[PDB]
Amino acid sequence: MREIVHIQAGQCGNQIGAKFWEVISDEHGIDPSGNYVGDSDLQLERISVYYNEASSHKYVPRAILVDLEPGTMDSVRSGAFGHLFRPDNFIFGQSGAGNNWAKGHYTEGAELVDSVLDVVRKECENCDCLQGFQLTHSLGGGTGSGMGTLLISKVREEYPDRIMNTFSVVPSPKVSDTVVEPYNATLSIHQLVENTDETYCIDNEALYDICFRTLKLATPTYGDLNHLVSATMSGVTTSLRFPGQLNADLRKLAVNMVPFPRLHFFMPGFAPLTARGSQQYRALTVPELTQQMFDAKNMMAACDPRHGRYLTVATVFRGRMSMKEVDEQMLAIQSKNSSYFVEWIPNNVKVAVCDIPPRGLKMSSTFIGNSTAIQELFKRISEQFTAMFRRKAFLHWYTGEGMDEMEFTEAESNMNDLVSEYQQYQDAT
Amino acid sequence: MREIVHIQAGQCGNQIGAKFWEVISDEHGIDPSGNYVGDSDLQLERISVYYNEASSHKYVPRAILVDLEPGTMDSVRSGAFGHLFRPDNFIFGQSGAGNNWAKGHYTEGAELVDSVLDVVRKECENCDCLQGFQLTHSLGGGTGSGMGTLLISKVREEYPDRIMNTFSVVPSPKVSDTVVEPYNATLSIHQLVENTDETYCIDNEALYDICFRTLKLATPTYGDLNHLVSATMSGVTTSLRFPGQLNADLRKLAVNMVPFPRLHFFMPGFAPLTARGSQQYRALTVPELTQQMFDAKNMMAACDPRHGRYLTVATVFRGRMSMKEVDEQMLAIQSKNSSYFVEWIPNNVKVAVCDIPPRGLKMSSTFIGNSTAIQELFKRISEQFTAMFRRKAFLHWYTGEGMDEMEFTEAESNMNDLVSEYQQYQDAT
Amino acid sequence: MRECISIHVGQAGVQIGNACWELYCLEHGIQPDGQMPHHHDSFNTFFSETGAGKHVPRAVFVDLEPTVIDEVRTGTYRQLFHPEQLITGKEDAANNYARGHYTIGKEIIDLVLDRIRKLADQCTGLQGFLVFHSFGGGTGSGFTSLLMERLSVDYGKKSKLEFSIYPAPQVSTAVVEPYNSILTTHTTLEHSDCAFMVDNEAIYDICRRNLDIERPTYTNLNRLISQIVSSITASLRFDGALNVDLTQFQTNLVPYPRIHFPLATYAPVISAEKAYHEQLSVAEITNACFEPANQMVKCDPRHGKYMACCLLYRGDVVPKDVNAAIATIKTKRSIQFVDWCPTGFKVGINYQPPTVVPGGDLAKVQRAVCMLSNTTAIAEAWARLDHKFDLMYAKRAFVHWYVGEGMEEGEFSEAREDMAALEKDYEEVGVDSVE
Ligand SMILES: Nc1nc2c(ncn2[C@@H]2O[C@H](COP(=O)(O)OP(=O)(O)OP(=O)(O)O)[C@@H](O)[C@H]2O)c(=O)[nH]1
Ligand SMILES: Nc1nc2c(ncn2[C@@H]2O[C@H](COP(=O)(O)OP(=O)(O)OP(=O)(O)O)[C@@H](O)[C@H]2O)c(=O)[nH]1
Ligand SMILES: Nc1nc2c(ncn2[C@@H]2O[C@H](COP(=O)(O)OP(=O)(O)OP(=O)(O)O)[C@@H](O)[C@H]2O)c(=O)[nH]1
Ligand SMILES: [Mg+2]
Ligand SMILES: [Mg+2]
Ligand SMILES: [Mg+2]
């Protein structure tokens, strides 16, 4: 009931998804072979939302892993946790997009999308009652950004009356992984703003600091970095996967959070984050949980909220608490930190409570804040994209595979408009 | 309830505190591992004042140990009694202040003062009522005096309606540990007399003499020296940690003993002080205890009271007695020694009685006297500072890191004013 | 039927009340937990009756610091008190009058008034308030002056009895006592109907000499004062051949509205071994209580005059030799009364002998005399305490703590001239009147 479709694009999506389906398997008591070995029947109460029933009590995920370059798939197939996926879903192309938008939207986008859309339709018809779509990708790569935009569009005419959540890894200010980031990002964001519902922007170096500073890890690899982002992603969904005292669903989050069609870029955060050695000297209690969430340091996006104002805020608890303690503390937060909240939405705190605590923790929480601190992220990206484009650098290889200058002019004009409306509403009276 | 924050600055504060939390742990029946192993229930009646309740009945002290160099924390962290502090509290820098005021208040202190201040605000949010701050530092070092004053000015801004006590270690008149003492001390006092409520001045040679003749020890190391100052420091606080016939607390002492805003420099003292061998030839009873404290020999500050007059006096008894025997002796002390008391404060004796004896003792006492004889101590220090400053010796390395000539002129101009009023009130009619 | 509520502020009030309420439960034969092992109402005046067999007192324990109330909660008398009435603050006044009357005391005075109103509505024939407050403390002196203002406005004209602890001349535990005592007296001079005074050292001489005790803990001192506290309200809870209720003391011991400062006394107070060698007759306990050395305030009566007196016998007492004993007492020239009071004695007899708690320093006696004297001899103590105040205030010592907590310097001047007026009147009416 209320089934969810999970789509993966680019190298990041497959690596994040590899850690994702690891978390879900432990949550639902699923052996790597694919057979139920747990005890509680509560996990079976709603198992069809993600997994799928099969013969001999086998379970297969509703995931569609697809990427142009094959190199990622041999890793997921040959590696562990590859005995439970559906071999038909393992879609791959022939050559990677090469960090090019054009090769991800016109050249190799044509033949690959037709194949992947077929598996979506078959998966949708198998579904009993569709709830929405989940897409995990990156805005810096070529295949994940370029094709993911194409897939988001092709899905959109097919299911107009549906919602989707895109958990994108937005590029960093400090360190840039690839040289031509702004060309892929600016083009991708223009299309997403047109035809998407909500978007959870996530940074890398911000999660780098969190792992090194708070968890005190000397060598934070991609294994640990992707592990933390999976827990936030599992926390967002678990409201409808598991019963709770004040339940919420993907539809509830979308409407509570998005006041306007063009302002749907969120910023997540998770708590508690404690080291292995320092967990014994801290009291696991709601006061410190909410305090840990509401500081700039424990935030998974590299934008300090102090330069902006929280437009709307969510908080999806887990474990067992009191609504009194939960909402008494939201009062203490609101009264003390009132200078940082937008004046013209009152009571802008949405709270939901579950009952199943996360593994190895008495209780935890997930904070999703639609803030005005993203305006500094888009301003910087637009600045980087502007200077590079005026001198017409790297342009010969987007023009040489389908596009021309009119796409670049209109994408820049739209992005300037969006940051204009974003600021003009923050400074409204 | 009525919690207090304990701050340690410099090497002395860390060394005093390392053995201070030794005596506090025995009083509350705390194993070195951090778990309660005591018997009497009265210990847990007020345990939150110093320790913090945590998961699985573990207790974590409310301490903030900070030094500009890592040479001090290596001992406490690696050594015993280091598995119960919270590692977040173990704040340290990279290079010591180097016995310089500038390198601890202007240049190097500012970098680390933001980290400790943020811990202070985070320190006892769980803590529900602040009673005050307890600071242990030195007036001769660089980090103990330099940034310790920096913390006092900054902390006072955030908690103005609160009282704090600094248990400083005032310099010596016979042997000086560091060559540039008067420059470091005088610059500190000009800032201390403005942002503190009361200061406990303690010497070292006076502690040496007491441990030599009275305790019969020929080679007292720093371990046997700091044990004497811990008991006095624990005696002042234990009024609000344990029940008593006539209770007192930190706020109570400040009212009785600060007649004027600038005259808040006290002189402690402890009794009984008897050797282990010669403990069988004395009868433990109130008669000798009151006589023991009021002689010049058993005084922890090297200033002979006979050259001055007591203004106000404490006697924070412990153990169990009858207040009649207490006031029968305070009457005998007053009548026989009436020449050593100021005329314009009648009945200037404050007495409080507790109900829990110190460890291995039937009864004990703590004497705190806001005597006038301190005026001879500041007279000597201002004499040494004057001789060094006209020659401008050692000064080319104070202006080179932030200061100038005008600052030194005002610090001495204010200090001679303080010794003027400290004596003008003694001779006032 | 007849109701009076007891308020205990400060550590002095709570500690005294722990022993005072320790004695009532023994006079009325109730166990500490409310069960039972003369008796026929009686207990309706102090012990409110719950539907079950348990009785709970009409007490209001209020303090600003929680150190002493927790002793009561965890003490042996834990199931007796009503858990709501034990009101605790967070931190005390730190022997500061300004703190406990302006800043922190104001933030909690509404909570205690709430429980006062709930307790008064539960009763029917309320008469007055018994306040056990000290003088030198912070929450026992400044906070109780606030309660007088709150109680007086709510209840217009009711007797307001106070059992103070007069600061001692030579004994002094606090350093700022002359500042607290002068301030609290000037404000309670108009909202108090009569204030009994007790000196802490005065019992010590009594306990050392008469009791023959070398271990005078605060428990031993507090046990002895509670006997006076109980026996003053002995006629309300017990029948008597000449009953005296709380309203008589207001009109028998208060010749003038300002001069309402009597002092207590108890007799006989003798040990157990000395009990055998004493006959303990009515003619001597009247003489013992009138002796100068048995007074419970460190002021000798010989330097002053007795304005009025009041005796409250109990037990095997005949109203004949009682009449005879006072007859010779008035004749005796050691004690002198004021001219305009030809009769200066009030008597009350009761049929219930006082009881003795187990292990007490006092010995069981079939008779007891409790003497409350309004006298001119207390005027000397006021002048002395006034001398200390003007000495400290001359140099403005300790002033900065008060002015920084919500007072002006002009207020200190008014409290000074007020005590000048009280002291001059205390001797102006005590001197002979011409014609
Ligand atoms: N969080 C996270 N991000 C990653 C990880 N690996 C790569 N990324 C991000 O993903 C981007 C890589 O772009 P992709 O879309 O994966 O490109 P690709 O899959 O190699 O194929 P092409 O687009 O054709 O190059 C980089 O900019 C990284 O910032 C990862 O393991 N975890
Ligand atoms: N009572 C006591 N005093 C000590 C002890 N150790 C050092 N001191 C005093 O502390 C002073 C040393 O200055 P500190 O404040 O420790 O200087 P620091 O912490 O090493 O930092 P720097 O000033 O930069 O060197 C000396 O004058 C000693 O009198 C100790 O173990 N017990
Ligand atoms: N008779 C008697 N007097 C006491 C006792 N305890 C304290 N006192 C008196 O109380 C005076 C001290 O002031 P308190 O009223 O006790 O102070 P407090 O009650 O703690 O309230 P704060 O001043 O705010 O701390 C002393 O001078 C004592 O004479 C007691 O147990 N019995
Ligand atoms: Mg790739
Ligand atoms: Mg050092
Ligand atoms: Mg008190």
Atom nearest to C95 CA in ligand 3: 23
The DSSP secondary-structure symbol of B245 reads: S
At residue B277, the 3 state secondary structure works out as helix
Residues C92 and C103: their CA atoms lie apart, in Å, by: 11
CA C408, C412, C413, C418 torsion: positive or negative? positive
Contact assessment for residue C364 and residue C270, using Cβ atoms and an 8 Å cutoff:
no
Q: Binding site annotation covers A426?
A: no
Tokens standing for C137?
């403390």
Query: DSSP letters of C235-294?
Result: HHHS--TT---HHHHHHHS-SSSS----B--EE----SHHHHT----HHHHHHHHHSGGG
Tokens standing for C210?
């008469």
How much distance in Å is there from the Cα of B90 to the middle of ligand 3? Answer: 42
Identify the domain boundary among A374, A390, A416.
Answer: A374
Q: Could you say which ligand is closest to the alpha carbon of residue C136? A: 3
Report which residue type is found at B405.
E
Q: Which of B323, B347, B368 to mutate to test the interface with C (most CBs of C within 10 A)?
A: B347
E-only strand ranges, A77-129: 91-92
Residues B348 and C173: their CA atoms lie apart, in Å, by: 9
Cis peptide before B272 (omega within 30 of 0): yes
A353: left (phi over 0), alpha (psi -120 to 50) or beta: beta
Identify the domain boundary among B257, B289, B323.
Answer: B257
End-to-end Cα distance, chain C: 48
Q: Rounded to whole angstroms, what are the CA distances from B51 to A338, B37, B167, C169?
A: 32, 15, 20, 42
Residues C77 and B411: their CA atoms lie apart, in Å, by: 59
Residues B22 and A204: their CA atoms lie apart, in Å, by: 45
Q: Measuring from atom 17 of ligand 1, which residue has the nearest CA?
A: A141
Question: What dihedral do alpha carbons A241, A246, A248, A252 form, nearest 10°?
Answer: 170
Minimum-distance CB partner of A281 among B60, B125, B126? B60
Contact assessment for residue A183 and residue A101, using Cβ atoms and an 8 Å cutoff:
yes
- Give start and end residues of each alpha helix (H) in B79-174: 102-105, 109-123, 146-158
Residues A345 and C74: their CA atoms lie apart, in Å, by: 50
End-to-end Cα distance, chain A: 44
Q: C200-209 and B323-336 are packed helices; what angle lies between their axes, rounded to 10 degrees?
A: 110
Contact assessment for residue C353 and residue C365, using Cβ atoms and an 8 Å cutoff:
yes
Name residue, tokens 């005591």.
B38
Q: Is A360 on the interface with B (CB under 8 A)?
A: no
Element (H, E) at A14: helix A10-27
At residue B318, the 3 state secondary structure works out as coil
- Tally of CB atoms within 10 A around A347: 7
Residue-level length of chain B: 429
Q: Answer yes or no: do A307 and A235 share one domain.
A: no
> B61 to chain A nearest CA, in Å?
10
Cis peptide before B160 (omega within 30 of 0): no
How much distance in Å is there from the Cα of A177 to the middle of ligand 1? Answer: 9
Residue-level length of chain C: 435
Query: DSSP letters of B65-102?
Result: EEESSTTTHHHHHHSSS-SSS-TTT-EE-SS---S-SH
Closest residue in B to A283 (Cα–Cα)? B54
A81 CA to centre of own chain: 22
Question: What residues of chain B lie within 8 A of the CB of C173, using their CB?
Answer: 246, 323, 327, 349-352
Residues C350 and C230: their CA atoms lie apart, in Å, by: 13
Q: What is the CATH number of the domain that holds B334?
A: 3.30.1330.20
CA C199, C204, C209, C212 torsion: positive or negative? positive
How much distance in Å is there from the Cα of A69 to the middle of ligand 4? Answer: 5
Closest residue in C to B41 (Cα–Cα)? C74
Q: Answer yes or no: do A239 and A290 share one domain.
A: no
Tokens standing for A140?
């810096």
The chains found to touch C (3+ Cβ pairs under 8 angstroms) are B
Residues A371 and A269: their CA atoms lie apart, in Å, by: 12
Residues C182 and C409: their CA atoms lie apart, in Å, by: 14
Radius of gyration of chain C (CA): 21
Element (H, E) at C8: strand C2-9
Paired strand residues for A193? none
Contact assessment for residue C345 and residue C204, using Cβ atoms and an 8 Å cutoff:
no
Q: Is C94 on the interface with B (CB under 8 A)?
A: yes
A384 CA to centre of own chain: 24
At residue C112, the 3 state secondary structure works out as helix
Residues B230 and B26: their CA atoms lie apart, in Å, by: 12
- Tally of CB atoms within 10 A around A230: 19
With a CB cutoff of 8 Å and minimum separation 6, the contacts of B211 are B217, B220, B224, B225, B228
Question: What residues of chain B lie within 8 A of the CB of A283, using their CB?
Answer: 52-55, 126
E-only strand ranges, B322-419: 349-352, 365-366, 369-371
How much distance in Å is there from the Cα of C92 to the middle of ligand 6? Answer: 5
Paired strand residues for C57? C47
Residues A86 and C32: their CA atoms lie apart, in Å, by: 76
Q: B323-336 and B286-293 are packed helices; what angle lies between their axes, rounded to 10 degrees?
A: 40
How much distance in Å is there from the Cα of A158 to the middle of ligand 4? Answer: 27
Give which of C250, C269, C225 is closest to C129, Cα–Cα: C250
Residues A142 and A401: their CA atoms lie apart, in Å, by: 14
With a CB cutoff of 8 Å and minimum separation 6, the contacts of B181 are B140, B171, B384
Minimum-distance CB partner of A284 among B55, B58, B86? B55
Question: What dihedral do alpha carbons A105, A107, A110, A111 form, nearest 10°?
Answer: -130
Residues C418 and C181: their CA atoms lie apart, in Å, by: 13
Q: Is A40 on the interface with B (CB under 8 A)?
A: no
Tokens standing for B278?
């010669």
Q: Answer yes or no: do B24 and B168 share one domain.
A: yes
Q: Per the structure, how many domains does chain B have? A: 3
CA atoms within 13 A on the CB side of C133: 33
Paired strand residues for A5? A133
Tokens standing for A31?
């052996």
Residues A215 and A278: their CA atoms lie apart, in Å, by: 9
Q: Answer yes or no: do A406 and A327 share one domain.
A: no
Q: Which of A215, A281, A333 to mutate to test the interface with B (most CBs of B within 10 A)?
A: A281
Q: Answer yes or no: do A286 and A238 share one domain.
A: no
At residue C170, the 3 state secondary structure works out as coil
Tokens standing for A116?
């992947």
Question: What dihedral do alpha carbons C204, C205, C207, C213 form, nearest 10°?
Answer: 100
Residues C310 and C297: their CA atoms lie apart, in Å, by: 16
Name residue, tokens 């624990």.
B234
Burial of B386 per CB tally in 10 Å (0-12, 13-18, 19+)? middle
B153 CA to centre of own chain: 18
Tokens standing for B326?
């207490």
Contact assessment for residue A401 and residue A228, using Cβ atoms and an 8 Å cutoff:
no
Question: What residues of chain C lie within 8 A of the CB of B131, using their CB?
Answer: 91
Q: Binding site annotation covers B166?
A: no
Name residue, tokens 């103005």.
B160
The DSSP secondary-structure symbol of A357 reads: P
Name residue, tokens 């005072």.
C20
Angle at the Cα of C104 from the Cα atoms of C102 and C105, rounded to 5 degrees: 65
Pairing mode, strands A349-353 and B3-9: unpaired
Angle at the Cα of B108 from the Cα atoms of B102 and B111, rounded to 5 degrees: 140
In chain C, what is the greatest distance between 2 CA atoms, to the nearest angstrom?
Answer: 66
Each as own residue / partner, the long-range contacts of residues A384-391 (CB below 8 Å, 24 or more positions apart, any chain) are A384/A181, A384/A182, A385/A182, A385/A183, A385/A185, A385/A186, A385/A412, A385/A415, A386/A412, A388/A182, A388/A183, A389/A182, A389/A183
With a CB cutoff of 8 Å and minimum separation 6, the contacts of C353 are C314, C315, C316, C365, C366, C367, C368
Are chains C and B in touch, 3+ Cβ pairs below 8 Å? yes
- Tally of CB atoms within 10 A around B281: 8
With a CB cutoff of 8 Å and minimum separation 6, the contacts of C424 are none
Give which of B178, B193, B160 is closest to B168, Cα–Cα: B193
Cis peptide before C268 (omega within 30 of 0): yes
Residues B155 and B116: their CA atoms lie apart, in Å, by: 10
Paired strand residues for C48? C56
Q: Rounded to whole angstroms, what are the CA distances from C427 to B212, B427, C194?
A: 61, 37, 18
Q: Is B31 on the interface with A (CB under 8 A)?
A: no
Helices (H) and strands (E) in chain A, counts: 14, 13
With a CB cutoff of 8 Å and minimum separation 6, the contacts of B356 are B27, B42, B238, B242, B243, B318
Q: Rounded to whole angstroms, what are the CA distances from B315 to A119, B50, B365, C11, C174?
A: 86, 23, 6, 19, 11
Residues C227 and C354: their CA atoms lie apart, in Å, by: 9
φ, ψ for residue A110 (rounded to 5)? -65, -55
Burial of A19 per CB tally in 10 Å (0-12, 13-18, 19+)? buried
Q: Binding site annotation covers A99?
A: yes
At residue A52, the 3 state secondary structure works out as strand
Q: Answer yes or no: do A247 and A380 share one domain.
A: no
Give which of C397, C382, C389 is closest to C413, Cα–Cα: C389
Name residue, tokens 């002033």.
C399
Element (H, E) at A192: helix A182-194
Q: Name every protein residue with a CB atom under 6 angstroms from any ligand 2 atom.
A: B 10-12, 15, 67, 96-99, 138, 140-144, 169, 177-178, 204, 222, 225-226
Q: What is the CATH number of the domain that holds B418?
A: 1.10.287.600
Q: Answer yes or no: do A215 and A290 share one domain.
A: no
Residues C240 and C238: their CA atoms lie apart, in Å, by: 7
Residues C5 and C246: their CA atoms lie apart, in Å, by: 13
Give which of C198, C195, C199, C204 is closest to C169, Cα–Cα: C199
Residues C76 and C15: their CA atoms lie apart, in Å, by: 14
Contact assessment for residue B11 and residue B144, using Cβ atoms and an 8 Å cutoff:
yes
Q: Answer yes or no: do B114 and B126 share one domain.
A: yes
Cis peptide before C262 (omega within 30 of 0): no
φ, ψ for residue C105 (rounded to 5)? -60, -35
Minimum-distance CB partner of B346 among C216, C218, C388? C388
Tokens standing for A89?
């879903």
Tokens standing for B118?
């943020």
Contact assessment for residue B256 and residue C175, using Cβ atoms and an 8 Å cutoff:
yes
Residues B273 and B235: their CA atoms lie apart, in Å, by: 14
With a CB cutoff of 8 Å and minimum separation 6, the contacts of C278 are C268, C270
Residues B292 and B295: their CA atoms lie apart, in Å, by: 6
End-to-end Cα distance, chain B: 43
> B326 to chain C nearest CA, in Å?
10
Identify the domain boundary among B223, B257, B291.
Answer: B257
Structural domain including A399 reads 375-427
Q: Answer yes or no: do A323 and A368 share one domain.
A: yes
Q: A182-194 and A374-390 are packed helices; what angle lies between their axes, rounded to 10 degrees?
A: 130
E-only strand ranges, A265-362: 265-266, 268-271, 310-319, 349-353
Residues C202 and C171: their CA atoms lie apart, in Å, by: 10
Q: Answer yes or no: do B171 and B131 share one domain.
A: yes
Q: Answer yes or no: do B209 and B341 share one domain.
A: no
Q: Is B86 on the interface with A (CB under 8 A)?
A: yes
CA C150, C154, C160, C163 torsion: positive or negative? negative
CA B376, B381, B387, B389 torsion: positive or negative? negative
Element (H, E) at A66: strand A63-67
At residue A421, the 3 state secondary structure works out as helix
Q: What is the CATH number of the domain that holds A210?
A: 3.40.50.1440
Question: What dihedral do alpha carbons B42, B44, B46, B49 form, nearest 10°?
Answer: 140
Q: Answer yes or no: do A290 and A351 share one domain.
A: yes
Hey, are the CB atoms on B322 and C394 less than 8 Å from each other?
A: no
Radius of gyration of chain B (CA): 21
Report which residue type is found at C298.
K
At residue C318, the 3 state secondary structure works out as coil
Contact assessment for residue A401 and residue A103, using Cβ atoms and an 8 Å cutoff:
yes
Contact assessment for residue B166 and residue B200, using Cβ atoms and an 8 Å cutoff:
yes
Residues A383 and A415: their CA atoms lie apart, in Å, by: 11
φ, ψ for residue A249 (rounded to 5)? -135, 175
Residues B139 and B149: their CA atoms lie apart, in Å, by: 10
Q: Measuring from atom 14 of ligand 2, which residue has the nearest CA?
A: B141
Residues C4 and C184: their CA atoms lie apart, in Å, by: 23
Tokens standing for A248?
């919420």
Atom nearest to A69 CA in ligand 1: 21
- Tally of CB atoms within 10 A around C282: 19
Paired strand residues for B136? B8
Residues A145 and B74: their CA atoms lie apart, in Å, by: 50
> B411 to chain A nearest CA, in Å?
39
Burial of A137 per CB tally in 10 Å (0-12, 13-18, 19+)? buried
Residues B351 and C174: their CA atoms lie apart, in Å, by: 7
Residues A78 and A66: their CA atoms lie apart, in Å, by: 16
Residues A351 and A329: their CA atoms lie apart, in Å, by: 12
Atom nearest to B98 CA in ligand 2: 24
Residues B352 and C424: their CA atoms lie apart, in Å, by: 36
Paired strand residues for C311? C347, C371
Paired strand residues for B3? B130
Q: Binding site annotation covers A69?
A: yes
